[PDB]
Each structure stands twice: as structure tokens, then as C-alpha cells.
Amino acid sequence: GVIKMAVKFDRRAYPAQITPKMCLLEWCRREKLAQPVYETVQRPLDRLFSSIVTVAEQKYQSTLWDKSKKLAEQAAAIVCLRSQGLPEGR
RNA sequence: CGAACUUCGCG
RNA sequence: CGAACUUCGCG
């Protein structure tokens, strides 16, 4: 049901002002698809986060956990872009 | 985490 | 929408 990859967003790997979430939003626009929908969840252990992104009725999620909601969403966008072999920026 | 606040970038 | 920046409140 969900496509997963072991990915973590590291801002240092991307030029300033460029993000996987932005790239995905732009790709959906060009492909005339909806708009990504993110469902984010919290861990009571280390106060860790994960996110499931829905694009073209398919769900994507990293196998890894992140320090914040925003970082988890970026990881989910990476899974979506990368699993499709899409640019994702840098 | 959320909200407010300026700056920046794409629609 | 998204990024950086401070502030507030709660957590």
C-alpha cells in the first residue's frame, strides 16, 4: 500500500530556497495532478516524527524518523520524487 | 507544535 | 505553498 525508501532530508544537500516539497508541488502542477497531501504522526519515545504523502492516489513514506514534522514531510517528498526517478533538486 | 512577524523563491 | 529570520503562547 505504501512505497518506502530509507531517506532523511539534509538541507545542506540542497541549494538555498530549494526543497523536495517544492519540487514535488511543482511536478504535480506540470503533470496536472492534485497537490501533495501530508499526514504527519508523533512518537512519544524521542519525540520523533514521520509523514505519509499521498500523490496520484499512492502513498509514500520514509522508513526513517525525523526530529520535526517539516523534516518528516521533506523525507516523504524525497520518497515520492526519488521512487519515480524525478529530479528532487540536489 | 501552533500562531503572529519582516525578508526571499515558485505558483 | 515552501525557505531563512525573530517574537508570543502552549507543549
Numbering used by the authors: 351 to 440
What does the paper say about this structure?
However, this belief has recently been challenged by the discovery of a dsRBD serving as a major tRNA binding module for human dihydrouridine synthase 2 (hDus2), a flavoenzyme that catalyzes synthesis of dihydrouridine within the complex elbow structure of tRNA. Dus2 is found in all eukaryotes and catalyzes formation of dihydrouridine 20 in tRNA. However, in stark contrast, we showed that, despite the presence of a HD domain, hDus2 and by inference from the sequences probably all animal ones instead use a novel extended dsRBD version flanked by a peculiar N-terminal extension (NTE) and C-terminal extension (CTE) to provide the major binding sites for tRNA substrate. By solving the crystal structure of this dsRBD in complex with a dsRNA together with extensive characterizations of its interaction with tRNA using mutagenesis, NMR and SAXS, we establish that while hDus2 dsRBD retains a conventional dsRNA recognition capability, the presence of an N-terminal extension appended to the canonical domain provides additional residues for binding tRNA in a structure-specific mode of action.
To investigate how this novel extended dsRBD recognizes a dsRNA molecule, we crystallized hDus2′s dsRBD (construct T339-K451 of human Dus2) in complex with an eleven palindromic oligo-ribonucleotide and solved the whole structure. The designed dsRNA, which harbors two overhangs at the 3′-extremities, self-assembles into a pseudo A-helix. Overall, there are no major structural changes detected between free and bound dsRBD, except for a notable modification in the twist of the C-terminal region of strand β1 induced by dsRNA that consequently alters loop β1–β2 conformation. Recognition of dsRNA is essentially achieved via three major canonical regions namely helix-α1, helix-α2 and the C-terminal part of the β1–β2 loop. Three residues of helix-α1 (T369, E376, R379) interact with ribose 2′-OH groups in dsRNA’s minor groove while K371 of helix-α1 together with K419, K420 and Q424 located in the N-terminal extremity of helix α2 recognize exclusively the phosphodiester backbone of the major groove. Remarkably, the C-terminal part of the β1–β2 loop binds to the mG+1 minor groove via R397, which makes hydrogen bonds with both the ribose and nucleobase C10. Note that animal Dus2 dsRBDs have a shorter β1–β2 loop, with 2–3 residues less than the one of archetypal dsRBDs, preventing the canonical mode of RNA recognition via this loop, and likely explaining the peculiar contacts observed for this region in the dsRBD-RNA structure (see also the discussion). Although the majority of dsRNA recognition is ensured by interactions involving the canonical fold, our structure reveals that there is a residue Q367 located in the NTE, more precisely between the 310 helix and the beginning of helix-α1 that also participates to dsRNA recognition. Q367 interacts with C8, A’3 and G’2 in proximity to helix-α1 binding site further extending the interaction surface with the minor groove.
